[PDB]
Amino acid sequence: GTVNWSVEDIVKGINSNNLESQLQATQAARKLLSREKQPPIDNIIRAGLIPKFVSFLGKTDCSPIQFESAWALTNIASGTSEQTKAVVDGGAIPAFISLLASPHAHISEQAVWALGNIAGDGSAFRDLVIKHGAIDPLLALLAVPDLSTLACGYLRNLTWTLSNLCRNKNPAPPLDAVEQILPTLVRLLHHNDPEVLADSCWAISYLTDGPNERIEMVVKKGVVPQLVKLLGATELPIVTPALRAIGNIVTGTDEQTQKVIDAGALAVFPSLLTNPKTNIQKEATWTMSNITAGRQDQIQQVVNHGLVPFLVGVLSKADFKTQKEAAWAITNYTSGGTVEQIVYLVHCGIIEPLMNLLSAKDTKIIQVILDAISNIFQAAEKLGETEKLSIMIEECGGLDKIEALQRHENESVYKASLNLIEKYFS
Ligand SMILES: C[C@@H](O)[C@H](NC(=O)CNC(=O)[C@H](CCCCN)NCc1ccc(-c2cccnc2)cc1)[C@@H](O)N[C@H](Cc1ccccc1)C(N)=O
Numbered sequence: 553g554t555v556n557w558s559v560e561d562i563v564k565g566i567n568s569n570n571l572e573s574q575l576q577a578t579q580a581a582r583k584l585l586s587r588e589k590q591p592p593i594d595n596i597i598r599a600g601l602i603p604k605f606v607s608f609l610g611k612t613d614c615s616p617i618q619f620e621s622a623w624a625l626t627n628i629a630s631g632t633s634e635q636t637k638a639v640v641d642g643g644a645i646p647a648f649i650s651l652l653a654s655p656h657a658h659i660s661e662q663a664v665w666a667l668g669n670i671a672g673d674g675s676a677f678r679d680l681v682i683k684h685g686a687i688d689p690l691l692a693l694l695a696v697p698d699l700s701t702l703a704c705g706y707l708r709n710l711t712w713t714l715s716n717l718c719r720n721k722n723p724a725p726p727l728d729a730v731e732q733i734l735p736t737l738v739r740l741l742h743h744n745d746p747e748v749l750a751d752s753c754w755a756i757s758y759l760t761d762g763p764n765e766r767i768e769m770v771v772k773k774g775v776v777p778q779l780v781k782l783l784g785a786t787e788l789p790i791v792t793p794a795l796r797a798i799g800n801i802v803t804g805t806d807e808q809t810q811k812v813i814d815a816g817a818l819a820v821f822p823s824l825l826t827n828p829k830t831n832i833q834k835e836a837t838w839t840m841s842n843i844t845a846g847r848q849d850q851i852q853q854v855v856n857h858g859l860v861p862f863l864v865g866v867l868s869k870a871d872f873k874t875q876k877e878a879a880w881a882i883t884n885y886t887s888g889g890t891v892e893q894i895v896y897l898v899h900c901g902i903i904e905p906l907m908n909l910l911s912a913k914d915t916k917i918i919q920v921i922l923d924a925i926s927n928i929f930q931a932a933e934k935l936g937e938t939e940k941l942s943i944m945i946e947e948c949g950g951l952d953k954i955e956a957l958q959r960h961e962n963e964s965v966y967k968a969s970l971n972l973i974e975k976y977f978s
Contacts, residue, residue: 562601565578574608575616578617594635602638603622609644644666652689661706665712666691668717671713672719673718690710694740708748714751718733720755724761738773741756749790750790755798755799757796770801776812780820783824785821786831798812798839799842821836822859826862835872840877863881863885872912875912891935897920904948907945909921919964929972
């Protein structure tokens with residue numbers, strides 16, 4: 553009986569002095585805003601309905617209209633940024649926080665979902681939600697001895713909303729709020745529900761997307777072994793953020809990187825570096841590029857796990873963005889590796905695919921490769937084997953690729969390749 557109302561009818565209903573008529577119009581409004589094709593959010597907004605919906609949130613005496621208006625507002629707040637703003641400007645945030653305490657689960661859950669949409673909109677709304685004190689009652693809802701006694705959908709919404717409080721940058725969330733949330737998050741990260749695990753991983757991946765101090769704050773909570781385990785999951789919705797998170801951690805200090813290696817991450821990388829999903833392969837290689845920028849003993853652990861041939865593989869054939877990542881991994885490896893580790897690199901076949909990418913119409917990857925070639929010559933210099941390396945590069949057609957770079961637009965390149973020609977090619 554609340555199917556297909558017009559906005560004018562809804563307004564008439566909501567403007568009556570009759571709580572039941574209001575409830576009926578609100579429900580009608582909810583159903584409109586729920587329809588799949590082009591819900592008329594903006595018409596609803598233009599009709600001045602948000603303030604009325606928000607005031608309906610306070611009707612403790614009429615829980616069904618609390619629920620319908622929460623749902624209606626939620627549909628609106630899950631739209632665009634201006635639509636979300638309209639919900640925030642109607643005073644929704646404290647009214648939703650009050651509803652977290654509702655004795656009716658379906659109402660509390662709706663409030664959880666609404667705050668998640670508002671906080672997920674941007675840094676400023678996220679921080680406004682935190683300032684209105686959302687975190688304490690959100691965490692209080694998860695304060696049970698075993699998470700398994702909570703309804704599955706309920707727990708998924710809470711996790712999702714928690715992950716939005718961790719999301720976005722400029723600024724990152726307040727340090728205080730991260731610390732408040734982190735222990736619950738570590739807990740959710742050990743729960744056995746794929747979606748809760750996915751969203752927990754996303755949350756950790758956001759918190760580790762920053763300066764080493766923020767990375768530290770997560771890593772000191774001991775999540776890395778669990779991340780590595782999730783890194784080995786079969787579900788792509790779990791692997792993807794676990795790898796993003798692991799990728800962020802290895803952009804940190806050598807000590808933070810070492811915890812990733814100690815947890816056994818490198819054992820998962822043969823499958824990641826050959827993963828059929830392009831973005832996994834790409835982020836796996838990025839991750840390697842940060843590990844090969846570590847200490848020589850960390851480069852050595854890459855060698856020991858048999859990962860150099862997989863780096864040669866990615867460099868040889870892959871999506872171009874992934875190959876760019878592999879080039880970095882190589883330059884970083886050659887930059888910091890021992891002479892013996894660089895010799896090993898060449899013996900694995902790095903030279904030919906390295907040269908084939910000198911044909912890439914991209915300035916940065918050329919600089920990166922030319923830099924790597926230079927590092928390898930510097931290793932050959934310490935062994936007096938510069939000439940043998942020269943013959944190697946020449947025979948796989950690499951020399952012609954380098955002379956052609958003499959004839960190149962950018963001159964950071966141009967001149968790097970001429971340094972190479974003069975110095976190592978008669
Ligand atoms: C831009 C650059 O500053 C960010 N990436 C880093 O790895 C930063 N790391 C360092 O500077 C280390 C610290 C040493 C760490 C010690 N363990 N020094 C050696 C080093 C130098 C250069 C590279 C390099 C540069 C460019 C590309 N690939 C690798 C890697 C290591 C950027 O790529 N971030 C991603 C982008 C992305 C994420 C996922 C997929 C695709 C892209 C993101 N936030 O989404």
